[PDB]
Amino acid sequence: VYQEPTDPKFPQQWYLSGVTQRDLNVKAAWAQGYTGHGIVVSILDDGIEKNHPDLAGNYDPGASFDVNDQDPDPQPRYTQMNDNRHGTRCAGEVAAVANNGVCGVGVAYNARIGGVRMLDGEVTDAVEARSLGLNPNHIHIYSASWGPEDDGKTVDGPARLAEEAFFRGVSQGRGGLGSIFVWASGNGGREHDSCNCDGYTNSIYTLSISSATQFGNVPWYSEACSSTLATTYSSGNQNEKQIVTTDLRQKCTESHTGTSASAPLAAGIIALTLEANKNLTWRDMQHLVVQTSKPAHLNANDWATNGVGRKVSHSYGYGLLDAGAMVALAQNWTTVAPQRKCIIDILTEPKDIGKRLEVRKTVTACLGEPNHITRLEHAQARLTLSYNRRGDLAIHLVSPMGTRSTLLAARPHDYSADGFNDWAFMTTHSWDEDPSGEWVLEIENTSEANNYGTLTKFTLVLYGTASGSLVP
């Protein structure tokens, strides 16, 4: 019989297990025998306290580096306000040691854990690339709780070196199975930010993770968008409990919060899943997340059923991660076929936007060709357009099976006149649908002002396979 941990703060880790069903079902995976043994996770952040009493026994120097000062030791820089505590808190969520009389436990408490010190300095494109491409035949899973500013007016993503690091990672990393990149979807909720305006979360190569409060609500800081894949618990109001983890100066904290705490919990659950099947590819892992995540009792006003009968939301993706279900489904999972890519250039001429524009196009999805796709994964609408006030635009895309994805909601603070320059808006909401048929793009002015502009390019990019489907 499995014996649950005895650590002094484990009873306060409400999100790991309980009778209530408001948890991530992690104890069920522990009882099947999976605790993370043999898996390696790296925290890309402001450093890691490698001598912390709840981290030292799992610390792995092969998963660590200091990019800011160019040395191998990722120890954080100590200051009066404890500014560099962020990475240490994230690491303890993944892999804090169990049954040692100290603080609580990680999701994957027997996994090996490291850190890249890269936020404590100027974060250039080169700095990101060296961190994402660190030791890719040793590190399995990378976790990033940072990104572009959440002011609700920025449009920004990885530059050339960073994007090259993503493609190298998923292609040649982990022995050719592909690095696993986990991302926090953002903290811009109060600014009405959209996580599709962030190229790191919007990327097909990252698993973008949102947050739910203890009582099952959308937190104040949460950003909605179509590129989010799934959700884990984090903080909410002051009557709701928070996240328990390792803190700077060898302390324990019960008040870790925000989008920053959701991605490390997902990285831990992915570590358990990899232990149950080491042969899973980067795309396999996203299939497992789509099939096993749980919507039940997450409150939102936009829940919709897609073409294959799955519930999906722009606040939550496919819902809460389920650790016990992930490791069960992983054990006899059959590897997916190689990824195909079908490119469809939609427009024959530019179109004025005006008050409202609708573009309809029937596609065959590369019928007759080696990249024919009948089973969709990610879809992108790559748009080039000019407009006088960018944040007044709302953009929607409808798939042939009837699924409406919000590519862009209104952003009140976005006054830019710079438009979008081939920006690849991404949606996960049509996963496993047949993409043959009519697609519809809608662009509208949500304000009463007399705005003007022109849509000059619309490329629909489809990714997926032509085999292996399951009954909806």
């Binding site: 402001d46 962020h86 936020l119 100027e122 974060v123 250039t124 940072w146 990104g147 500013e149 959440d150």
Partner: peptide, 6 residues
């Protein structure tokens, strides 16, 4: 003044 934020 920062390109990337925690």
């Amino acid at each position: 003044a920062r390109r990337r934020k925690k």
